[PDB]
Amino acid sequence: MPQCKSITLERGPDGLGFSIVGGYGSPHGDLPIYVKTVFAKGAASEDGRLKRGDQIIAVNGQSLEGVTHEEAVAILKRTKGTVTLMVLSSDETSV
Secondary structure, X not given: OOEEEEEEEOOEOOEOOEEEEEEEEEOOEEEEEXXXXXXXXXXXXXXXXXXXXXXXXXXXXXXXXXXXXXXXXXXXXXXXXXXXXXXXXXXXXXX
């Protein structure tokens, strides 16, 4: 049961505190942008919502549809202030 969530983070000194994989023309194929790891002690982890496997659909309303890996990183890293991520998330959680 895949659901849409809005997750709001304040950057720490280490950024949003997660990594991404995927992207149009990515080494794995033409993929959406997926959260891979949520780092211990970072903003995404302290917030407690974002998780491995979440697909980042938008960043402060700016769509990631069809973007390359590098495009997604630029949007994620340059977007100013409080960051609201629109994500598509699964019911299941990896452990």
